[PDB]
Design a binder for this molecule. Structure first.
Ligand SMILES: OC[C@H]1O[C@@H](O)[C@H](O)[C@@H](O)[C@@H]1O
Ligand SMILES: [Ca+2]
Ligand SMILES: [Ca+2]
Ligand SMILES: [Ca+2]
Length: 191
């Protein structure tokens, strides 16, 4: 399916910009197994960047596991040119940030990836910016997929939560991502 992204430039703090409450939550519904952990996320775009605000309900937080994806984290995947390739292309991006704000990259240049995270009672918040290389304009479509790695007190990932891909191959296969179409940028203060 296709998510529609409104135009806007939020401030990366791990605080909720006023302008975030004007767009909608997205619910990832693909669970690997049954779990307490739930999530919701919002999207925005501006002339330079893609913006993501995520909130995870998760009562037990762990990142003792030295495997990045085996920590309470979230992963974002991007197909910028919208190649819907079978394997990762030169413009394909795959990053991850744990609750502590520790960033790791599976695909693409991590210098593009700017993140802050806040602890909440029984969860955390992630606010990320991704520098765009292509000039985003209304109607632009890209590949996008979102995932929540849920670990337990054993320091191991027990469950995943996915927005688009239920197969578990998002980390291999760009074509498994979903759609984001950008809209809402102007064509054109009085004190
Ligand atoms: O390190 C690559 C990892 O990427 C993640 O997207 C997947 O959930 C893991 O199963 C995979 O091993
Ligand atoms: Ca903010
Ligand atoms: Ca957990
Ligand atoms: Ca691509």
């Amino acid at each position: 399916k296709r998510i529609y992204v409104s135009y806007g430039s939020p401030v990366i703090d791990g605080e909720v910009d006023d302008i975030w409450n004007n767009v909608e939550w997205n619910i990832p519904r693909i669970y690997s197994a049954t779990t307490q952990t739930n999530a919701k996320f919002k999207l925005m775009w501006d002339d330079n960047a893609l913006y993501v605000l995520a909130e995870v309900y998760d009562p037990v937080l762990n990142s003792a596991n030295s495997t990045p994806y085996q920590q309470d984290s979230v992963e974002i995947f991007l197909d910028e040119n919208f190649d819907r390739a079978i394997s990762y292309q030169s413009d394909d991006l795959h990053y991850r940030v744990n609750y502590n704000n520790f960033k790791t990259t599976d695909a693409g240049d991590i210098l593009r990836f700017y993140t802050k995270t806040k602890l909440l009672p029984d969860g955390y918040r992630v606010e990320a910016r991704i520098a765009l290389s292509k000039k985003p304009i209304n109607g632009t479509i890209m590949g996008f997929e979102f995932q929540v790695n849920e670990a337990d007190s054993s320091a191991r990932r027990v469950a995943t939560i996915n927005m688009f891909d239920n197969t578990g191959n998002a980390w291999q296969n760009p074509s498994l991502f979903g759609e984001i179409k950008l809209k809402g940028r102007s064509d054109n203060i009085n004190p």
